[PDB]
Amino acid sequence: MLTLKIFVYTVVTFFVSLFIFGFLSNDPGRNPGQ
Amino acid sequence: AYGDAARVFAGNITNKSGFIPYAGEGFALLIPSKWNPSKEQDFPGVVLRYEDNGDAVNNLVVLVQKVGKNNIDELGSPDKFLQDNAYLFGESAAFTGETLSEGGFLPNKVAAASVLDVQEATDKKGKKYYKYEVLTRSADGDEGGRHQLIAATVSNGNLYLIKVQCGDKRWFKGAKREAIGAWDSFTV
Amino acid sequence: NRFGTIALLAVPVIGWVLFNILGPLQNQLN
Amino acid sequence: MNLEIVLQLTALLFIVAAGPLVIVLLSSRGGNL
Amino acid sequence: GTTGRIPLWLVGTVAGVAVIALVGIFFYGSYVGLGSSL
Amino acid sequence: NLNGFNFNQSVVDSQGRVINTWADIINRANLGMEVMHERNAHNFPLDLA
Amino acid sequence: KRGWFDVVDDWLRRDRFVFVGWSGLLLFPTAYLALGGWFTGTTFVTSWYTHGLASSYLEGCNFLTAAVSTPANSMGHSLLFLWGPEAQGDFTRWCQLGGLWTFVALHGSFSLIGFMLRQFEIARSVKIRPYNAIAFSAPISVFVSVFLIYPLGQSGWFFAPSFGVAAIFRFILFFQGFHNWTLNPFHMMGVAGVLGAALLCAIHGATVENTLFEDGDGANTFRAFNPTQAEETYSMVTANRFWSQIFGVAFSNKRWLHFFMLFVPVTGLWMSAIGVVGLALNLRAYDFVSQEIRAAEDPEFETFYTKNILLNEGIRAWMAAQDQPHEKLVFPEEVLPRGNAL
Amino acid sequence: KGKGYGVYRFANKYGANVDGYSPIYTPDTWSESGDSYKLGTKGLIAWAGLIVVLLGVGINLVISTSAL
Amino acid sequence: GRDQESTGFAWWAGNARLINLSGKLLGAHVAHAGLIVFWAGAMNLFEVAHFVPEKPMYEQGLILLPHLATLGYGVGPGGEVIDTYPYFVSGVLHLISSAVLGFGGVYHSLVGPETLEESFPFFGYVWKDKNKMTTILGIHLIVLGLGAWLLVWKAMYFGGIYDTWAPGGGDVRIITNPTVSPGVIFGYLFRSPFGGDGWIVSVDNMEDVIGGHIWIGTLCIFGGIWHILTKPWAWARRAFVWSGEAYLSYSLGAISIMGFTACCMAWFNTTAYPSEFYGPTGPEASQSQTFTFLVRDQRLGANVASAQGPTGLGKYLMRSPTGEIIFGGETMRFWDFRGPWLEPLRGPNGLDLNKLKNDIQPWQERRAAEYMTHAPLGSLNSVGGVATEINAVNYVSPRSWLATSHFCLGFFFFVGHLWHAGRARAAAAGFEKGIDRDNEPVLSMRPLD
Amino acid sequence: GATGERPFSDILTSIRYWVIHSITIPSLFIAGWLFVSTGLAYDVFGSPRPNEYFTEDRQETPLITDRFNALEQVKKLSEV
Amino acid sequence: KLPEAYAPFDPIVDVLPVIPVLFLLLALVWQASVSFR
Amino acid sequence: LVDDRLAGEGTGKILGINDPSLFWAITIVFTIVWGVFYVSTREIDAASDRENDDDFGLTL
Ligand SMILES: CCCCCCCCCCCCCCCCCC(=O)OC[C@H](CO[C@@H]1O[C@H](CO[C@H]2O[C@H](CO)[C@H](O)[C@H](O)[C@H]2O)[C@H](O)[C@H](O)[C@H]1O)OC(=O)CCCCCCCCCCCCCCCCC
Ligand code: CLA
Ligand code: CLA
Ligand code: CLA
Ligand SMILES: CCCCCCCCCCCCCCCCCC(=O)OC[C@H](CO[C@@H]1O[C@H](CO)[C@H](O)[C@H](O)[C@H]1O)OC(=O)CCCCCCCCCCCCCCCCC
Ligand SMILES: CC1=C(/C=C/C(C)=C/C=C/C(C)=C/C=C/C=C(C)/C=C/C=C(C)/C=C/C2=C(C)CCCC2(C)C)C(C)(C)CCC1
Ligand SMILES: CC1=C(/C=C/C(C)=C/C=C/C(C)=C/C=C/C=C(C)/C=C/C=C(C)/C=C/C2=C(C)CCCC2(C)C)C(C)(C)CCC1
Ligand SMILES: CC1=C(/C=C/C(C)=C/C=C/C(C)=C/C=C/C=C(C)/C=C/C=C(C)/C=C/C2=C(C)CCCC2(C)C)C(C)(C)CCC1
Ligand SMILES: CC1=C(/C=C/C(C)=C/C=C/C(C)=C/C=C/C=C(C)/C=C/C=C(C)/C=C/C2=C(C)CCCC2(C)C)C(C)(C)CCC1
Ligand SMILES: CC/C=C\C/C=C\C/C=C\CCCCCCCC(=O)O
Ligand code: OEX
Ligand SMILES: [Cl-]
């Protein structure tokens, strides 16, 4: 059961870190406006 | 037509005591105004029955039975009189079996009655009364128990008895006032 | 008599309306 | 018609009448609205 | 005779006050009298 | 637990008796479907939850 | 225009603030009478002698609890005319007997007929297509099946809906307790249609309002439109791409979009009407026989369907005594179904 | 910044905007009468007398028909 | 004022015409603050004038008075109101200060300078000037930290605050040893929001509250000083939208979270919201009902420990899914409740059978009965009891009002944050007024599959 | 445009309009008040006054059982 | 209740809290008088 | 007891960490993603054809 908890924690933190550091990567500049 | 004007700008309420007086054949009592007449005759000798609009558990009934004795004490002691008239709380005749899985009940018993208070007193006229206060509990335990108020007397060779029922749930929510008022107003 | 009171209340209203509007009403009719 | 109720109604009328009174005063005199 | 009109915003304000007073009277009458549970 | 309007026993006649209403019929239906929503899950008279 | 018909048609089909038309002669009197009957019944007429309740402002009821009540069950399906063999010309006793309900219903049905006729006539005068008139068939069918066909297949008008808020709520609860109306596939289609229509309305409004075109310099975009313009005011290509990448499918045809918008709620309401027509004869999808048999044989099998069955049983048992005074049901407190401690 | 469109881009092509197409407040079409009361000051005085009398009658009737 | 002719904003969006007018915006904000103080004072005066001493606070529909009671003003041992003068003083002070605030707002909105960037350079700002906005943020952070420290000083030196867990009944104590342990402070903050944990709503003593307030005051002061002396870094300039509407959206999201937290704290907490002034909570009423029924049935000669219910689980006492002895029935879901009248009967492994068999006190029984009858159930027209009751009781719990109102406010302000964040992101990019017909972005992309 | 009637904005801002209608609307309001207060509403539409819900004869709710004698039955039930 | 010295001013207190709603209505009235320019 | 379980629900742990392995997993994954982002954040900024001065960002 501890292995499942470790695996789920790893997956969740991976996806949340992806979300955070993707929205930190100059997101407002990705628009078609001139 | 009628011609009666509407009671506009009237600062008085016609009835606010919460009780409606009743004059019967040899007895009188104050019936709660929020109750309605009923057509049920559960006990022998029923001459009056009223039940609450919001709950049929709250009710009162008046029994006038024929007896030989001219006085209430000749029917026995108050404990003996209550023991003889134990059918007023109903019977568990439909349940025919043995069980041991009840909460606070004797074996093979799904109901019980706790005699909380007994009293013997005489009215202003000089007629003796037998007053009881019981709390009957069920195996399932609906309403958290039922409160039974009984006042019995004998007049002109007939036994006059009143039983007022009120669920505990309504009893502690403020409906004990009407039940106690109806119980204390029984005059013969 | 109860309806008579309401009718008597309504009479001056009709009188006033007729007094205030008779001219233009007659003009519109022609 | 209680005296307390009459006083409450009077106070409510005074408070309510203080709102449009400013607007009426400023509109009648041609103020900067 | 009497030149001039009535402001439409004044008319609207008076009508709104009247309907609000009517609704308030209805609520007060709901809290006392007939159908007030007491 | 901030329920809807409760117009139960609201219309009362001069002597104090209760005149029923469609709200009271709805209340009777609610009482019918209340004492049966969980048969054996209750040990005490009030459903405070 | 010289004939009587020609001059009457010239006056009736005139350009006016309120269009009268040939259908106005049927619509306006009946609609006015129905509205007046409802208002009079809710304000002054009571329901003490036909139902045992109070249903008027005069007796102390608010907007929610005031209604025009149905006649007693003894009257059966009588049309209850003011001059009929029951009221016999007495207006006060006609009102007391419940004749205002039939008055309102019979005038309202003809008002609905007149309104569809008015839609047809106005569409023909302006030289367009009668799809709006076709769309009113769903409300008319709902009204016909609920207020006429269902009571006509029952004991009497007593089991019809009463014109009020709490009365309609009681009607809904009765339909749940006795008919198991929630478990009817036709009602399920009706619910799906209504909810899908609301979804379509919201999504179309938002999509049009958020794909507009820059036709002005102000932040208030409502002033950059002109009804007589040629170009469309929003970007169908952009809307289609957005909804294709978000949802997976999207509209590419405005005509198909708007026909689907018309089609969904009408079909839902018609299906619900068919369901109520079937229910008029107590042909209710009430139970699953396999589930009942399995629960009877095995005292351990329980699903949500059985719990709903028990709830319906409780509703029936506890509402029967007061909802149907004619049956004169006296129920001892020990025969009513009840749970433990509740 | 503005692009020079104004309130409506095609104002010249279609004449005006939606506001200039279907107005709901046109004082030009208002009746020439109605801005002056023909009955004058005497009519207003008669109206004041009538409204005072009617208010008194109404309050008297409301008080009398009620239960005080 | 202005008009749609020279602004482009309609009358229903007229407050957007003063986005770039610093003086008028300041006047509007000052007037709104005056309105808030006016409501506080007027409501306090209304509640103090309609208060009777024969009924508890929660039975009279009061929501501002219990806030002053928890600060130890005009209350005594056990939670009984003794003096009602400090409430009057607070209301009068608020109402009088509202006049000054309103005059300042009216002046700054009507006849004050329209744009204070040329005459008052210290107070002037530009929405796109990051340094000035950060400086203002730091100043207000310092002010908030001072407010938190002001709250801290009350519980220490100026008479203290009401403590519902004090020995010998609740009373106004003085907090001498606040909990400033990093492990304790971080335990509340990074706790789960689910049952049993409860996040910060589960704070169960006033020492933790005072320690957390010391922490928050120090943090706010340090952060204000940090922001006054610095400017946003590259990683912050690369991630945010810098405009007034964007800042508004950020604040809206923050205060929506705050509103949801306030709703949950009002519904669930018992330390900062004593039941003596707010009434019983949700679980508290159920636990009280089970307790009083157990007491009554025990007085009738029954074995509560060995009593068996209809389902075979236990009528009065059962076991929680982890082992603790808990009350039986449907109140088995509320076994996480912890109240001052129930803790003395609880041992290391749950409820103590001997303690509740021989050492139950009449004051505990009275508290249980009172919290049983005053359950937080009611209707919209203020009718106490379940939905299938009669018109006899005029009562709705103060917890219900606060919880419902603040959940509604929190949800609506979350929606407002969504609206304003979207509009700010679109307007900064430059397509908030629609798509450009000449250069439509979609027409330049390759078609999908 | 316009269908050939006086604009509502023109009518509602007229001294003549507000002189005529300073009498009619209050007159109708007072007429309705007098209709209710004089007891006409009870008599015309047959609604029970608060003291006429239950008579000394019957203390239960009324019930109509006959369809063709309904007039006489409701006359008997309404007896005071 | 209010202190005995402030008893005569009780009716003033009973109507205070509606003033913010009156303020919102007053803003609407001012916009109407300005004629929604 | 009959069986074994983690026995951690309703306790109040920081981030639900009862074993240091969860902390190690969280920290390692976060650090890896942060390092990957940190290497490239210089190149990402240069796509705007502007320098990250005090006037950088989406402004209005
Ligand atoms: C950093 C980002 C987030 C990371 C984590 C995200 C996890 C997401 C998981 C998926 C599910 C969604 C979240 C479920 C939350 C359930 C909250 C709950 O069961 O309970 C909420 C808890 C309450 O905790 C309670 O706290 C209580 C406190 O205990 C003690 O409290 C007092 C202490 O003195 C008394 O002594 C009392 O007797 C004693 O019991 C008890 O412990 C209870 O058992 C416990 O449940 O509140 C709180 O955590 C405080 C408020 C929390 C936030 C607001 C919640 C409400 C709003 C929901 C979201 C918005 C909805 C609207 C917008 C919709 C559209 C977008
Ligand atoms: C505009 C059309 C209109 C229509 C379609 C209806 C429809 C209806 N009304 Mg309503 N009504 C209306 C207007 C209308 N009403 C008006 C203006 C009033 C005055 C307030 C009323 C007042 C009213 C009352 C008081 C009642 C109704 C009721 C009804 C029903 C009448 C049943 C009946 O037997 O009819 C009569 C039958 C017909 C078939 C008539 C048609 C006969 C044709 C034209 C032949 C003519 C031949 C004849 C021998 C010669 C006559 C000519 C000569 C005298 C000049 C019916 C649902 C009843 C009700 O709803 O009960 C619940 C009822 O009680 N109505
Ligand atoms: C929360 C309250 C509130 C506040 C403080 C403001 C504030 C402001 N509004 Mg906004 N507004 C609001 C709500 C509010 N508004 C609402 C609800 C709407 C929708 C109807 C609008 C719609 C709106 C529009 C359409 C406009 C504004 C504008 C303005 C600003 C200019 C004021 C002015 O020129 O006219 C003030 C006009 C008058 C002379 C009326 C004076 C009445 C006074 C102020 C009443 C308050 C007095 C009080 C009774 C007593 C205080 C005195 C003290 C001693 C106690 C001002 C800062 C204007 C703007 O954009 O400026 C550039 C403008 O164009 N507002
Ligand atoms: C009023 C509230 C407030 C607000 C709105 C801001 C706003 C801002 N801060 Mg400031 N700050 C504040 C208070 C505030 N701060 C306080 C009290 C402190 C002292 C701790 C600081 C210290 C601070 C630093 C050190 C930095 C900022 C920075 C910034 C900017 C980056 C936005 C950001 O947070 O990234 C979005 C948020 C995140 C990606 C995650 C943050 C959430 C944290 C990690 C949660 C856990 C809390 C943390 C471990 C603290 C311990 C908890 C406590 C019990 C001790 C932004 C302008 C940055 C900057 O630009 O400076 C010029 C920066 O580097 N702030
Ligand atoms: C705070 C920094 C935020 C940075 C930006 C984040 C952007 C959004 C990212 C995605 C967020 C949603 C998904 C999160 C999934 C992982 C979390 C999870 O499931 O934890 C679930 C775990 C459950 O942990 C459980 O713990 C038990 C013992 O207590 C047992 O050990 C269980 O085995 C264990 O699973 O809970 C936590 O990790 C606690 C999280 C506490 C968070 C505190 C945040 C404080 C600062 C913010 C305050 C406001 C927060 C919002 C409040 C209002 C909301 C309306
Ligand atoms: C126009 C219009 C409208 C409106 C309506 C209405 C109905 C309104 C109203 C309004 C109003 C009705 C307002 C009011 C206001 C008020 C105010 C603003 C007040 C204030 C006050 C104060 C501030 C006070 C103070 C005081 C104190 C506290 C103490 C003692 C003294 C005194 C009293 C002074 C409508 C919607 C229809 C539509 C559109 C248009
Ligand atoms: C029966 C009958 C008849 C008829 C009659 C009529 C036709 C009547 C009418 C009547 C009417 C025609 C009435 C009306 C009424 C009305 C009312 C009563 C109203 C009210 C209103 C209100 C209350 C409102 C409210 C509101 C407000 C204020 C706010 C917003 C919303 C609303 C709008 C809702 C006849 C004789 C022929 C024959 C026999 C039978
Ligand atoms: C600008 C503007 C606005 C706003 C405004 C505002 C928001 C204002 C506010 C204002 C304010 C916020 C004010 C206040 C005032 C206050 C006062 C004036 C007070 C007074 C008080 C008193 C007088 C008191 C007395 C007393 C005492 C001392 C004790 C006890 C008893 C009594 C209570 C009697 C509007 C919306 C219109 C729109 C346009 C623009
Ligand atoms: C007084 C007190 C206390 C204390 C408290 C404290 C100390 C607190 C703290 C708190 C805190 C310290 C908090 C914080 C928070 C934070 C947050 C909430 C954040 C957020 C963030 C965000 C939202 C972000 C976003 C983003 C991303 C992710 C990406 C990119 C973009 C951006 C940046 C936008 C206690 C409980 C002991 C007890 C009671 C009392
Ligand atoms: C080179 C030295 C420099 C810096 C290192 C400093 C501190 C390291 C401290 C702790 C690292 C392990 C953290 C463990 C967190 C708690 C885990 C748990 O709760 O089991
Ligand atoms: O679980 Mn589902 O439903 Ca909430 O109330 Mn109590 O618990 Mn049971 O009963 Mn009712
Ligand atoms: Cl339980």
CB A23 to CB I239 under 8 A? yes
Q: Which residue, among G65, G210, G214, would best test binding to I if mutated, counting the most I CBs under 10 Å from its CB? A: G214
Q: Which amino acid is at J30?
A: I
CA distance I413 to I249: 9
Instruction: For residue I347, give the H/E element and its range.
Output: strand I346-347
Owner of token pair 């959940």:
I407
Q: How many CB atoms lie within 10 A of CB B157?
A: 11
- I411: tokens are 């949800």
Resolution rounded to one decimal, in angstroms: 3.0
For the CA of G92, the nearest ligand: 7
For the CA of I28, the nearest ligand: 3
> Per CB distance under 8 Å, which residues of I are interface residues toward F?
282-283, 285-286, 289-290, 293, 309-311, 315, 328-331, 333-334, 372, 375-381, 383, 386-391, 396-397, 400-401, 404
- F12: tokens are 């009362």
Alpha carbon of E25: minimum distance to chain G alpha carbons (Å): 13
CA distance G116 to G23: 9
Would you say the CB of residue I5 lies under 6 angstroms from ligand 11?
Answer: no
- DSSP letter string, G158-216: GGSPPEEHHHHHHHHHHHHHHH-GGG-HHHHHHHHHHHHHHHHHHHHHHHHHTSBB---
For the CA of I39, the nearest ligand: 8
With H, G, I as helix, E, B as strand and everything else as coil, classify residue B23.
strand
Helix/strand/coil (H/E/C) assignment for every residue in chain I: CCCHHHHCCCHHHHHHHHCCCHHHHHHHHHHHHHHHHHHHHHHHHHHHHCCCCCCCHHHCCCCCHHHHHHCCCCECCCCCECCCHHHHHHHHHHHHHHHHHHHHHHHHHHCCCCCCCCCCCCCCCCCCCHHHHHHHHHHHHHHHHHHHHHHHHHHHCCCCCEECCCCCCCEECCCCCCCCCHHHHHHHHCCCCCCCCCHHHHCCCHHHHHHHHHHHHHHHHHHHHHHHCCCCCHHHHCCCEECHHHHHHHHHHHHHHHHHHHHHHHHHCCCCCCHHHHCCCHHHHHHHHHHHHHHHHHHCCCCCCCCCCCCCCCCCEEECCCCCEEECCHHHHHCCCCCCCCHHHEECCEECHHHHHHCCCHHHHHHHHHHHHCCCCCECCCCCCCCCCCCCCCCCCHHHHHHHHHHHHHHHHHHHHHHHHHHHHHHHHCCCCCECCCCCHHHHCCCCC
**Alpha helices (H) along chain B:** 78-84, 168-170, 176-184
CA distance I294 to I286: 12
Owner of token pair 């008029």:
G280
Would you say the CB of residue L15 lies under 6 angstroms from ligand 5?
Answer: yes
G67 to chain F: which residues are within 8 Å by CB? 22
User: Hey, is the C-beta of I436 within 8 angstroms of any chain G C-beta?
Assistant: yes
Would you say the CB of residue L22 lies under 6 angstroms from ligand 5?
Answer: no
Owner of token pair 């960002």:
L57
- Pocket residues: Cβ below 6 A from ligand 9: A 20, 23-24; I 185, 188-189, 200, 203, 208-209, 212-213, 215-216, 239
Which residues have a Cβ under 8 Å from the Cβ of I14 and sit 6 or more positions away? I1, I2, K31
Report the candidate in I183, G300, G92, G126 with the shortest Cα–Cα distance to residue J41.
G92
CA trace torsion I105, I108, I109, I112 (10° rounding): 160
Chains C vs L: touching, with 3+ CB pairs under 8 Å? no
Q: What's the DSSP call for residue G145? A: I
Radius of gyration (Cα) for chain I, nearest Å?
27
Strand pairing of B35-37 and B46-52?
Answer: antiparallel
- I358: tokens are 């021989």
Which residues have a Cβ under 8 Å from the Cβ of G85 and sit 6 or more positions away? J68
Strand ranges, E, within J1-80? none
- A33: tokens are 């406006």
Burial (CB count within 10 angstroms: exposed 0-12, middle 13-18, buried 19+), residue B155: middle
Which residues have a Cβ under 8 Å from the Cβ of H31 and sit 6 or more positions away? J6, J10
Would you say the CB of residue I201 lies under 6 angstroms from ligand 1?
Answer: yes
Would you say the CB of residue F34 lies under 6 angstroms from ligand 11?
Answer: no
Atom of ligand 4 nearest to the CA of I219: 17
CA distance G36 to G25: 17
Partner residue facing F8 (CB), from I289, I310, I389: I389
Distance I194 CA to ligand 1 centre (A): 6
CA distance I444 to I429: 18
CB B103 to CB I390 under 8 A? no
Distance I99 CA to ligand 8 centre (A): 5
Q: How far is CA F8 from CA F18, F49, I127, I390, in A?
A: 9, 22, 58, 5
D11 to chain K: which residues are within 8 Å by CB? 11-12, 14-15
Would you say the CB of residue L15 lies under 6 angstroms from ligand 10?
Answer: no
Q: Residues I418, I407: contact at Cβ < 8 Å?
A: no
Helix axes I182-189, I206-228, angle to 10 degrees: 90
CB D19 to CB K26 under 8 A? yes
Q: Give per-residue burial for I1-28: e unless 16+ CB within 10 Å, then b.
A: eeebeebbbbbeebeebbbebbbbbbbb
Sign of CA dihedral I58, I63, I69, I73: negative
Alpha carbon of F33: minimum distance to chain G alpha carbons (Å): 5
Which residues have a Cβ under 8 Å from the Cβ of I315 and sit 6 or more positions away? B103, B104, F43, I304, I307, I308, I309, I328, I329
Partner residue facing K29 (CB), from D10, D11, D23: D23
* Residue J21, marked binder: yes
Q: What's the angle, vertex CA I284, arms to CA I280 and CA I285, rounded to 5? A: 75
Q: Residues D17, E14: contact at Cβ < 8 Å?
A: no
Q: Which amino acid is at H21?
A: Y
- L23: tokens are 């902390």
Distance I248 CA to ligand 9 centre (A): 18
β-partners of residue B131 are B119, B151
User: Hey, is the C-beta of B21 within 8 angstroms of any chain F C-beta?
Assistant: no
Alpha carbon of C20: minimum distance to chain J alpha carbons (Å): 7
Q: How many CB atoms lie within 10 A of CB I177?
A: 8
Q: Residues H24, J1: contact at Cβ < 8 Å?
A: no
User: Hey, is the C-beta of F18 within 8 angstroms of any chain G C-beta?
Assistant: no
Q: Give per-residue burial for G226-239: e unless 16+ CB within 10 Å, then b.
A: beeeeeeeebbebb
Burial (CB count within 10 angstroms: exposed 0-12, middle 13-18, buried 19+), residue I404: middle
CA distance G24 to I427: 52
CA trace torsion G243, G247, G249, G254 (10° rounding): -40
Would you say the CB of residue G122 lies under 6 angstroms from ligand 2?
Answer: no
CA distance I310 to L29: 53
L7 to chain I: which residues are within 8 Å by CB? 322
Q: Gaps (C–N > 2.5 Å) in chain D: which residues precede them?
A: none
CB I8 to CB G217 under 8 A? yes
Owner of token pair 């159930």:
I377
Chains G vs E: touching, with 3+ CB pairs under 8 Å? yes
End-to-end CA distance of chain I: 54
With H, G, I as helix, E, B as strand and everything else as coil, classify residue B19.
strand
Would you say the CB of residue I190 lies under 6 angstroms from ligand 5?
Answer: yes
CB E7 to CB J14 under 8 A? no
Burial (CB count within 10 angstroms: exposed 0-12, middle 13-18, buried 19+), residue K17: middle
Residue of A nearest to I237 (CA): A26
- DSSP letter string, A1-34: -HHHHHHHHHHHHHHHHHHHHHHTTTGGG-SS--
Q: How far from the centroid of its chain's Cα atoms is residue I233's Cα?
A: 33
With H, G, I as helix, E, B as strand and everything else as coil, classify residue B38.
coil
User: Hey, is the C-beta of I433 within 8 angstroms of any chain L C-beta?
Assistant: no
Q: Which residue, among J9, J12, J19, would best test binding to H if mutated, counting the most H CBs under 10 Å from its CB? A: J19
CB G44 to CB J47 under 8 A? yes
CA distance G93 to G85: 12
Chains B vs F: touching, with 3+ CB pairs under 8 Å? yes
Atom of ligand 1 nearest to the CA of I269: 32
Q: Residues B44, B56: contact at Cβ < 8 Å?
A: no
Residue bearing the CA closest to ligand 8, atom 27:
I92
